[PDB]
């Protein structure tokens, strides 16, 4: 193998890392193999893949299981104080499986978010374009784009012998000059692996947020009219009819800005002229002359909020220190003091990103009430 000279041979080598990080990788392994296996069992065997989102959710759990296969290799790697005994081939596969799982999982969530926008907002116009053949071709492209993105993890990842400490590690060697490694390999994980897909995921669920709000606020405007019409019928003085007719005019204009609504608002304005002059009987008749169980979930906005923030806060620690790794590689910063805090937090950020990512096929599954039903029958 190659012999290299580490600039900061003590960066990241901490005893609390050699104990806590391998233990965390074991927790991610047990929880990941447990959760993602049940998602495959419920979807592929109890549901037979009948929707587009089921194809994405199945491959989202399959790609996570492939990452967890190499996770014990990194657990004992960190346990032996960053010593790689599995040879050069097994690291080109293990380092690629980490990079392949990042792009694949984030691409699948992007298309799953786009599918949720089309299904909720345009159910009739996007039904014929969202088929099973499109869902499978989308996944094989996601595999290729992820493999094309994890290609440098197979070409340049090598086993290097460190002359400073006689320790055999596997790594990217950020050579000072004449390095065959691309300069901004960490920038690709920033924009293609986080920035661009998150902006598509955030946009998709923001459009769903606005669409459901327009529908829910419209239903609230009709409920305000009918409830106030019942208040007018049970009113006894001019104040009760004036307060209810004022709420109806305001609700009618709210419902209009969502087209004979001006005809209704004009008649409410006529009923207001009667209630203001002390005519209580004449105002009740006007509202009586002019004028059912839709499904609704007022907690869907909390779910949309949780989906977006769970993707952001799980990857934003890993992507920031990945971007900090690019600055050290480009020469913007060469201090070994900041290389230590970057090399220590990087296993921490991996424990946060890939533990939340291996719970995504399970969390997205529990959103489907049919999936939640088969899941609890397996545990019962």
């Amino acid at each position: 193998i190659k012999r290299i000279q580490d600039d900061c041979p003590k960066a990241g080598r901490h005893n609390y890392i050699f104990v806590m990080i391998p233990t965390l990788y074991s927790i991610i392994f047990v929880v990941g193999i447990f959760g993602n296996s049940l998602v495959v069992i419920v979807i592929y065997f109890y549901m037979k893949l009948k929707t587009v989102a089921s194809v994405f959710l199945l491959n989202l759990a399959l790609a996570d299981l492939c990452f967890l296969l190499t996770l014990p290799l990194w657990a004992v790697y960190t346990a032996m104080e960053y010593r790689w005994p599995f040879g050069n081939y097994l690291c080109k596969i293990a380092s690629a499986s980490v990079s392949f799982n990042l792009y694949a999982s984030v691409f699948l969530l992007t298309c799953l978010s786009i599918d949720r926008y089309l299904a909720i907002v345009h159910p009739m116009k996007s039904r014929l374009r969202r088929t099973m053949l499109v869902a499978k071709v989308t996944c094989i492209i996601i595999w290729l784009l992820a493999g094309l993105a994890s290609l440098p993890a197979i070409i340049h990842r090598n086993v290097f012998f460190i002359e400073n400490t006689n320790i055999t590690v596997c790594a990217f060697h950020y050579e000072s000059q004449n390095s065959t490694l691309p300069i901004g390999l960490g920038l690709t994980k920033n924009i293609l692996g986080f920035l661009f897909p998150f902006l598509i995921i955030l946009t998709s669920y923001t459009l769903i947020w606005k669409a459901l709000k327009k529908a829910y606020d419209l239903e609230d405007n009709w409920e305000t009219l009918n409830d106030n019409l019942k208040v007018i019928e049970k009113a006894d003085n001019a104040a009760q009819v004036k307060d209810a007719l004022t709420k109806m005019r305001a609700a009618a204009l709210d419902a209009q800005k969502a087209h004979g609504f001006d005809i209704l608002v004009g008649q409410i304005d006529d009923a207001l002229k009667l209630a203001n002059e002390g005519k209580v009987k004449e105002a009740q008749a006007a509202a009586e002359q002019l004028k059912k169980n839709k499904p609704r979930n007022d907690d869907i906005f909390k779910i949309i909020m949780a989906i977006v923030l769970f993707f952001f806060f799980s990857w934003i620690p890993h992507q920031i220190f990945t971007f900090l790794d690019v600055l050290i590689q480009l020469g913007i910063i060469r201090d070994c003091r900041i290389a230590d805090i970057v090399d220590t937090a990087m296993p921490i950020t991996i424990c946060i990103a890939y533990f939340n990512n291996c719970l995504n096929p399970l969390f997205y599954g529990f959103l489907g009430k049919k999936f939640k039903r088969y899941f609890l029958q397996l545990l019962k």
Partner: peptide, 7 residues
């Protein structure tokens, strides 16, 4: 150079 030994 620098050693990016992380997974």
């Amino acid at each position: 150079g620098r050693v990016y030994y992380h997974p």
